[PDB]
Each structure stands twice: as C-alpha cells, then as structure tokens.
C-alpha cells in the first residue's frame, strides 16, 4: 500500500554523569529495523530485522559514523539551548529529532518530515513544502535564521526526495515477505459480570499487523463512542499488536450490541456479538 520510513533520535543530558545518553531507532512502517545506543560497550548501529542483515560492512560503518556524529551534534546543541532559554547547567534536558518520508503505492514521495523538540515540546519543524520552517518560539527563531543562512531546507529536501524514497523502496522489496504482508486481527468478545444488573462486553483484536485498526461498539446500530473504553494499541512483542474496546451493558440486553472491526488485513469489516 502506502509506506513510511522514520528515524527517531533522543539525547538526554545528565550533568555530573558524563555525556548525554543518545538512542536512535529506525522504522519502516511499524517494523523496527535498526538501533544505536550510546551506552553500549563499544556502540555500533545494529540490525533488528532479517531483511536489513544483508547490507554489507560499509553500510554499518556509515550508519555508525552518522549515529556517533548525531550524538556529538546533540551534545553541543544541548549546551546551546541552555543559553537560548537562560537555563542553569544543573538539570537534565531532552532533545528529540524525527525525520523520514512517506511513499504511495507507486513508490512516489507523498510527504517528507524533519522536526525537532526540546524538553518534550516542539522546537523547530521543516514544513511540508520542504522549503520553509516553523519555529515554536524566539529561541527557535535563532536556529531558523542560522538554517536559512545555510540553506539547510534545500539540503534536507534533496535527501527526503532522493535517498529517503530510494532506500525505502529497496527495504520494501528486500523485506517483502513481512513489510508487504498484513496480518488480520484474531477477534472475539468476552463477558465480565459487574453485578446482577450489568456486565462488561470486551471486544478483542489480537495478532494484527500493521498497528492501524478501528474497533467500535454499536447498540441497535448507533455508535457508543462516549460509553466505550478503548485501550491504546499495544505491542505483543513479536511483530504484532493488540487492542480491545469495552462497553458496560444492562443484563439481558447483550444481543443489542455489536462490535465492528476494520483492519487492512481484512477483506470487509467484521461484525461480532457476544456468543454465550
């Protein structure tokens, strides 16, 4: 279908406890494929999916060099940000970066991304045009001015339209067994008495990939979304995900309620009921 690639990066300063901790991971869709952690013995970027293992030594060398360089850039930038925000050197702070690209079924660029956050809030983002910036505040405007002067947006555009798309396409082909397979949810409804008067109906979806799914309850064909407890989609630890949706219902009225499941792995939406 459509596909995405993303690289995520987090640096966390720890004054008095050495250099910042730096962790970066890469994903294609909802599949982790590479990782780097600065607090490994002698750190290297490492494979986390079978289809990336075939890349040669030069790939891993280059990736590792980039990861180490990013860590060092972040280390300096954390110091810079204490100046920009008139902060003391005493506390731990966080820099996060994401970048990557989305492609359509034909493999053409749909959207590119590059965005940074300080202390868990937006700092500066490349706009969808891959040409202009959104700065969150007057500190980030200082960054924006430097990046405009250095024509950074144009450099990112060249990567995002070029290598990002080209390498995503390579990974999708090499990983076609898994990246191009949707596993449908295994579904069922359970019943959990609360009293003689009422009970929870819980609609389960298990073992699905990718993570995107919709689960809803209806009563007599009307959505119950204000009354539905819907847990966050959660990883099973293989490659698959889990989710459930629950409604509290009066005793004897269970057959009024239907659960509806949409997922890319399913031909048509499912409709399910409690089956005693």
């Amino acid at each position: 279908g459509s596909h995405s690639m993303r690289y995520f990066h987090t640096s966390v300063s720890r004054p008095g406890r050495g250099e910042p901790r730096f962790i970066t991971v890469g994903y294609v869709d909802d599949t982790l494929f590479v990782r780097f952690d600065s607090d490994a013995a002698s750190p290297r970027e490492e494979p986390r999916a079978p289809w990336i293992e075939q890349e040669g030594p030069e790939y891993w060398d280059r990736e590792t060099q980039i990861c180490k360089a990013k860590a060092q850039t972040d280390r300096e930038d954390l110091r810079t940000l204490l100046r920009y925000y008139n902060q003391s050197e005493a506390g731990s702070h966080t820099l996060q970066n994401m970048y990557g690209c989305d492609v359509g079924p034909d493999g053409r660029l749909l959207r590119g991304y590059h965005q940074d956050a300080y202390d868990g809030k937006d700092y500066i983002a490349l706009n969808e045009d891959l040409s202009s910036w959104t700065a969150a505040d007057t500190a980030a405007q200082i960054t924006q001015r430097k990046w405009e002067a250095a024509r950074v947006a144009e450099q990112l555009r060249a990567y995002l339209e070029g290598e990002c798309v080209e390498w995503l396409r390579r990974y999708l082909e090499n990983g076609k067994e898994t990246l191009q397979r949707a596993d449908p949810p295994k579904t069922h409804v359970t019943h959990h008495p609360i009293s003689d008067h009422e009970a929870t109906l819980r609609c389960w979806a298990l073992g699905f990939y990718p993570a995107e799914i919709t689960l809803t309850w209806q009563r007599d064909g009307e959505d119950q979304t204000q009354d539905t407890e819907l847990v966050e989609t959660r990883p099973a630890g293989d490659r698959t995900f889990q989710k459930w949706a629950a409604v509290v219902v009066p005793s004897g009225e269970e057959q009024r309620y239907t659960c509806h499941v949409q997922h890319e792995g399913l031909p048509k939406p499912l409709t399910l009921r409690w089956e005693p």
Binding site: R62, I66, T73, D77, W147, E163, C164
Partner: peptide
C-alpha cells in the same frame, strides 16, 4: 539509510 548532513541549533 540515514542522512549524512546535519547542522547545529
């Protein structure tokens, strides 16, 4: 694969 270039804040 990752980008080669980056720039200080």
């Amino acid at each position: 694969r990752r980008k080669w270039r980056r720039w200080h804040l």
